[PDB]
């Protein structure tokens, strides 16, 4: 099972555990992740869903260049549409969760490997965490909700600049931009911080939390759903163009 | 007695909350008088500004009173709740759609909707000693009186979730950092002078141009707010039918 | 004599404002030339970026000139005003919907629409010495050339109302703080090398991917802006019929 699940004190922990691809995003992990998010969402008794990685070195490597290359080489678009469908549903199901959603970024989180977590209510990173948005050099458009979330979180102009620079950036920079909400210095502090955070969530009333999130989001989930569809079409179109195959090959 | 006073001075309408019994708390009686004052100001062609303030040193507004909310949770029907939400939502919408420059002066504490209604104003100025509270999380209710519309637009979604989770009394400095207020004055005298100067700057403008400017800047937002207020109403009414809310209000 | 020059260099179109007669003022003449330059750039498959700049050290653009505005105000038909708005509004929209990376280099002062049109660009870079002005409040007019769309989205509603109310000449530092510009360069030469480096970074990408990226990020905003430009025109036209506007322009 590409992801592990456990409920403790009325909170669901979803742990990415896919060493073969370093927590990479493909159709199989995606399907397993989606199932887990949906189970948490449908679980009346929990108040929170925590997304995390089991592996010290990384949170998620994101979509794998090797896997993308296969999609570029595929002339049917089926492989590409397949993986995007599942991962897009993961993003949407996180975004529309009635539970308080938190992502714990312990290690590096590249591309969609970070971006999917932008759908969470809060993102907390270890100091050592590193981030990367590499669409520009790859010759592709942003996906997995990135075109929706980035401008809304950090602003359009800063999004264009972040994508243009395509740098490995620090947790400090991510905090400054508002991509993440806070930084913990080490594993133990993160562990304590999370415990305290969930204690605070538990003092609320589950249906009130759900209504609150619903009201705050308003028409956003409808907008995101539409944007995910547009991202899909733009990316598929680009993946039919030789330049994209060439860049993926080179990489 | 009347709990909302009105006065025009030099082409500015001053709306003053005066409800000491309930510390300027929000109920249908105050709401009704407040709405009437807001509309009268919006319909007055000579004024360029509307100033909302409290006549009482200790507090701006305690917001909807716990005891009153407890009554609504105890009610047999939802008629009382819908009635007060109706009047107070209209206050919010009528401030928001005012053609006049709207300013709220937060002198003392402003809790829940006692503060949140004023988020519809063009500018919010607080005394340093002002304190603020958003306590929906512990109360087990959803945000109302526009708070679900204004908070994420002003401070961001992530920040709104965290503010609500913490439910702490917070300072004017914190309110300023978040953008909930636009500036702080240290005392009543300084505030009185600042307002004088600010209204002077406003008066140098042209009333119809000011109205056109506000209309353009807001675009479709007024319709969106109106719809959101309706949704807040339905969500809150649904929660007040659940025994947990009565239990929670009863304990507080 | 053409008031807008174009040159392609390093896979980028440089559009240069060269209108000393009006200190790079915005009229239908310069506007027509600028629009042609923008469209040419947007349809040029061999470039990745469009750079907008001024040839003159003293100013970027003095914006719509008071003298020209007065003429429109004194005119008994709305045709000349609607004609200039039509072309300039198209410049704004066509910058905003450009598939190329768009950068404005603000070297000297930029007043009103002279700055505001550039808010449609992906990046605004100013020389430290640049100065800015939004003077709608004193002029008695509503914001135009997209300003009513861009200002609240970039700096916030409350901050926009205050910016307009104060109508002060402000520094590049303040522009940067507000988010109206993205960065500051100390001098012409550093700016030249910065732009060179920036364009190199852009060139590392793939033109159709840049275009698709911008299209996705913008979503429905292009249609929103187009409608909003139409609203700005409708309101400005109504105000220019009023005696107060002519009086204020003359005074100025």
Q: Distances from the Cα of C196 to the Cαs of A160, B93, C69, in angstroms?
A: 17, 50, 37
Q: Distances from the Cα of A176 to the Cαs of A132, A172, A182, C161, in angstroms?
A: 15, 6, 10, 26
Q: In the structure encoding, which two tokens stand for residue B101, read together?
A: 């420059």
Q: What is the rounded end-to-end Cα distance, in angstroms, of chain C?
A: 29
Q: Which residues, in sequence order, are bridge partners of residue B126?
A: B106, B184
Residue in C140, C156, C231 nearest the CB of B209: C140
Burial of C237 (0-12, 13-18, 19+ CB in 10 A): middle
B/e letters for A191-224, b = 16+ CB within 10 Å, e = fewer, are: eeebeebbeebeebbbbbbbbbbbbbbbeeeeeb
Q: Which residues, in sequence order, are bridge partners of residue C15?
A: C6, C52
A220 touches chain C (CB under 8 A): no
Cβ(B65)–Cβ(B27) below 8 Å: yes
SS3 C84: helix
Cβ(A140)–Cβ(A238) below 8 Å: yes
Cβ(A140)–Cβ(A111) below 8 Å: no
The conformational region for residue B24 under phi > 0 = left, psi -120 to 50 = alpha, else beta, is left
Distance CA C25, CA C60 (A): 9
Cβ(C60)–Cβ(C95) below 8 Å: no
Q: In the structure encoding, which two tokens stand for residue B77, read together?
A: 């029907």
**Yes or no, beta carbons of A211 and B238 under 8 Å apart:** yes
Q: In the structure encoding, which two tokens stand for residue B64, read together?
A: 């909807």
Distance CA A55, CA A68 (A): 23
**Yes or no, beta carbons of A142 and C217 under 8 Å apart:** yes
Distance CA B160, CA B157 (A): 5
| Closest Cα in chain A, distance from residue B55 (Å) | 33
- Chain CA centroid to CA C149, Å: 13
Burial of A1 (0-12, 13-18, 19+ CB in 10 A): exposed
φ, ψ for residue C30, nearest 5 deg: -65, -35
Q: In the structure encoding, which two tokens stand for residue C72, read together?
A: 């429109």
Alpha-carbon Rg of chain C, whole angstroms?
17
φ, ψ for residue C37, nearest 5 deg: -65, -45
Q: In the structure encoding, which two tokens stand for residue A126, read together?
A: 């270890």
Q: Which helix (H) or strand (E) holds C16?
A: strand C12-17
Residue in B182, B205, B206 nearest the CB of C158: B182
Sketch the domain layout of chain B as residue ranges: 1-252
3 state SS for chain B: CCCEEEEECCCEEEEEECCHHHCCECCHHHHHHHHHHHHHHHHCCCCCEEEEEECCCCEEECECCHHHHHHHHHCCCCHHHHHHHHHHHHHHHHHHCCCCEEEEEECCEEECHHHHHHHHCCEEEEECCCEEECCHHHHCCCCCCCHHHHHHHHHCHHHHHHHHHHCCCEEHHHHHHHCCCCEEECCHHHHHHHHHHHHHHHHCCCHHHHHHHHHHHHCCHHHHHHHHHHHHHHHHHHHCCCHHHHHHHHHC
Q: Distances from the Cα of C153 to the Cαs of B217, C93, C156, C216, C221, in angstroms?
A: 9, 16, 6, 18, 11
Q: Return the partners of chain B (3 or more C-beta pairs < 8 Å).
A: A, C
Distance CA A99, CA A209 (A): 7
Determine the residue of chain A that is closest to C124 in CA distance. A157
Q: In the structure encoding, which two tokens stand for residue C95, read together?
A: 């910058």
Residue ranges of the alpha helices (H) in chain C?
28-42, 66-74, 79-96, 113-116, 136-139, 147-155, 157-166, 172-178, 188-203, 207-218, 221-240, 243-251
Q: In the structure encoding, which two tokens stand for residue C7, read together?
A: 């040159």
**Yes or no, beta carbons of C122 and A155 under 8 Å apart:** no
Determine the residue of chain A that is closest to C123 in CA distance. A157
Determine the residue of chain A that is closest to C120 in CA distance. A157
Q: In the structure encoding, which two tokens stand for residue B54, read together?
A: 């409290």
Q: Does domain B1-252 fall into CATH 3.90.226.10?
A: yes
Distance CA B143, CA B113 (A): 9
Helices C79-96 and C221-240: crossing angle in degrees, nearest 10, is 160
Backbone CA torsion sign across C237, C238, C241, C247: negative
Distance CA B100, CA B47 (A): 7
Determine the residue of chain C that is closest to A244 in CA distance. C206
| Closest Cα in chain A, distance from residue C122 (Å) | 6
**Yes or no, beta carbons of B216 and C141 under 8 Å apart:** no
Q: Return the partners of chain C (3 or more C-beta pairs < 8 Å).
A: A, B
Residue in C156, C235, C244 nearest the CB of B212: C235
C122 touches chain A (CB under 8 A): yes
Determine the residue of chain A that is closest to B158 in CA distance. A121
| Contact residues for B9 (Cβ-Cβ < 8 A; gap 6+) | none
- ∠B120-B126-B132 over CA atoms, to 5°? 75
Distance CA B111, CA B93 (A): 19
Residue in C166, C232, C235 nearest the CB of B201: C166
SS3 A115: helix
Helices B207-218 and C147-155: crossing angle in degrees, nearest 10, is 70
| Contact residues for A210 (Cβ-Cβ < 8 A; gap 6+) | A98, A99
Per DSSP, the residues of A9-60 read: TTEEEEEE--GGGTSB--HHHHHHHHHHHHHHHT-TT--EEEEEES-TTEEE
Q: What is the rounded end-to-end Cα distance, in angstroms, of chain B?
A: 29
How many CB atoms neighbour CB B120 within 10 A?
24
How many CB atoms neighbour CB A115 within 10 A?
27
| Contact residues for A60 (Cβ-Cβ < 8 A; gap 6+) | A16, A22, A23, A24, A25, A53, A109, A110, A113, A114
- ∠B80-B86-B91 over CA atoms, to 5°? 130
The conformational region for residue A89 under phi > 0 = left, psi -120 to 50 = alpha, else beta, is alpha
Residue in A137, A155, A243 nearest the CB of C204: A137
Total residue count of chain C as it appears in this document = 252
Distance CA A76, CA B242 (A): 53
Which chain A residues are within 8 Å of B141, Cβ to Cβ?
208
**Yes or no, beta carbons of B213 and C152 under 8 Å apart:** no
Residues 161-200 of C with CB under 8 A from A: 179, 182, 198
C95 touches chain A (CB under 8 A): no
Which chain A residues are within 8 Å of C217, Cβ to Cβ?
142, 147, 150-151, 156, 159-160
Q: By C-alpha distance, which of C219, C225, C131, C113 is closest to C172?
A: C131
CATH class label, A1-251: alpha beta
Distance CA A162, CA A158 (A): 6
Distance CA C134, CA B203 (A): 17
C251 touches chain B (CB under 8 A): no
Distance CA C98, CA C152 (A): 22
Q: By C-alpha distance, which of A25, A127, A173 is closest to A86?
A: A25
Residue in A201, A204, A218 nearest the CB of B228: A218
Q: In the structure encoding, which two tokens stand for residue A11, read together?
A: 């909170």
Distance CA A233, CA C212 (A): 10
3 state SS for A127-189: CCCEEECCHHHHCCCCCCCHHHHHHHHHCHHHHHHHHHHCCCEEHHHHHHHCCCCEEECCHHH
SS3 C56: coil
**Yes or no, beta carbons of A244 and C216 under 8 Å apart:** no
- Breaks in chain B (C to N over 2.5 Å), named by the residue before each, are none
Which chain B residues are within 8 Å of A153, Cβ to Cβ?
158
Distance CA A168, CA A166 (A): 7
Cβ(C238)–Cβ(C144) below 8 Å: no
Q: By C-alpha distance, which of B224, C10, C224, C59 is closest to A218?
A: B224
| Contact residues for A183 (Cβ-Cβ < 8 A; gap 6+) | A124, A125, A126, A127, A171, A172, A175
Q: In the structure encoding, which two tokens stand for residue A20, read together?
A: 């073969």
C244 touches chain B (CB under 8 A): yes
φ, ψ for residue A75, nearest 5 deg: -90, -5
- ∠C89-C28-C227 over CA atoms, to 5°? 15
Q: In the structure encoding, which two tokens stand for residue C133, read together?
A: 């002005």
Residue in C123, C205, C219 nearest the CB of A227: C219
**Yes or no, beta carbons of C162 and B179 under 8 Å apart:** no
Distance CA A212, CA A214 (A): 5
Distance CA B194, CA B125 (A): 10
HSE of B137, CA atoms in CB hemisphere, 13 A: 20
Helices C188-203 and A156-165: crossing angle in degrees, nearest 10, is 70
HSE of A25, CA atoms in CB hemisphere, 13 A: 29
| Closest Cα in chain B, distance from residue C152 (Å) | 7
Determine the residue of chain B that is closest to C235 in CA distance. B212
B/e letters for B146-159, b = 16+ CB within 10 Å, e = fewer, are: bbbbbbbbbbbbbb
This structure was determined by X-ray
**Yes or no, beta carbons of C143 and B213 under 8 Å apart:** yes
Q: Return the partners of chain A (3 or more C-beta pairs < 8 Å).
A: B, C
φ, ψ for residue A169, nearest 5 deg: -115, 160
SS3 C4: strand
Distance CA A231, CA A145 (A): 8
Which chain B residues are within 8 Å of A200, Cβ to Cβ?
165-166
Instruction: Note the resolution in Å, 1 decimal.
Output: 1.7
Cβ(C82)–Cβ(C232) below 8 Å: no
Determine the residue of chain A that is closest to B248 in CA distance. A205
SS3 A241: coil
| Closest Cα in chain A, distance from residue C73 (Å) | 36
Distance CA A187, CA A124 (A): 12
B224 touches chain C (CB under 8 A): no
Q: By C-alpha distance, which of A117, A36, A96 is closest to A224?
A: A96
**Yes or no, beta carbons of C206 and A164 under 8 Å apart:** no
| Closest Cα in chain A, distance from residue B224 (Å) | 9
Q: In the structure encoding, which two tokens stand for residue B221, read together?
A: 């937002």
φ, ψ for residue A147, nearest 5 deg: -70, -20
Q: Report DSSP state, residue C167.
A: -
Total residue count of chain A as it appears in this document = 251
Distance CA C37, CA C222 (A): 20
- ∠A168-A172-A173 over CA atoms, to 5°? 55
HSE of B140, CA atoms in CB hemisphere, 13 A: 23
B216 touches chain C (CB under 8 A): yes
Residue with tokens 């909350």: B17
Total residue count of chain B as it appears in this document = 252
Distance CA C239, CA C248 (A): 12
Cβ(B33)–Cβ(B68) below 8 Å: no
Residue in B179, B202, B218 nearest the CB of C165: B202
CB pairs under 8 A between A and C: 74
| Contact residues for B77 (Cβ-Cβ < 8 A; gap 6+) | none
B73 touches chain A (CB under 8 A): no
How many CB atoms neighbour CB A78 within 10 A?
10
């Amino acid at each position: 099972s590409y992801v592990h699940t456990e409920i403790q004190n009325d909170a669901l922990y979803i742990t990415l555990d896919y060493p073969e691809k370093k927590n990479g995003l493909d159709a199989e992990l995606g399907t397993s992740l989606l199932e887990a998010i949906r189970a948490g969402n449908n679980e009346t008794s929990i108040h929170s869903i925590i997304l995390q990685s089991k592996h010290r070195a990384y949170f998620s490597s994101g979509p794998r260049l090797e896997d993308l290359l296969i999609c570029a080489s595929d002339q049917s678009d089926v492989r590409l549409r397949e993986v995007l469908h599942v991962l897009n549903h993961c993003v949407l199901e996180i975004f529309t969760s009635p539970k308080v959603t938190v992502a714990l970024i312990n290690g590096y989180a590249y591309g969609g490997g970070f971006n999917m977590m932008l759908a969470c209510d809060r993102r907390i990173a270890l100091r050592r965490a590193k981030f990367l948005e590499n669409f520009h050099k790859m010759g592709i458009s942003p996906d997995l909700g990135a075109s929706y979330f980035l401008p809304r979180i950090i602003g359009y102009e800063q999004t264009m600049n972040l994508l243009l620079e395509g740098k490995l950036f620090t947790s400090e920079e991510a905090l400054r931009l508002g991509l993440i909400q806070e930084i913990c210095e080490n594993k133990q502090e993160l562990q304590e911080r999370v415990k305290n955070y969930l204690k605070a969530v538990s003092e609320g009333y589950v249906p009130a939390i759900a209504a609150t999130k619903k009201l705050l989001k308003g028409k956003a989930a409808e907008e995101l759903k539409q944007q995910l569809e547009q991202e899909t079409e733009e990316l598929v179109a680009l993946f039919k163009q030789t330049e994209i195959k060439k860049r993926l090959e080179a990489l």
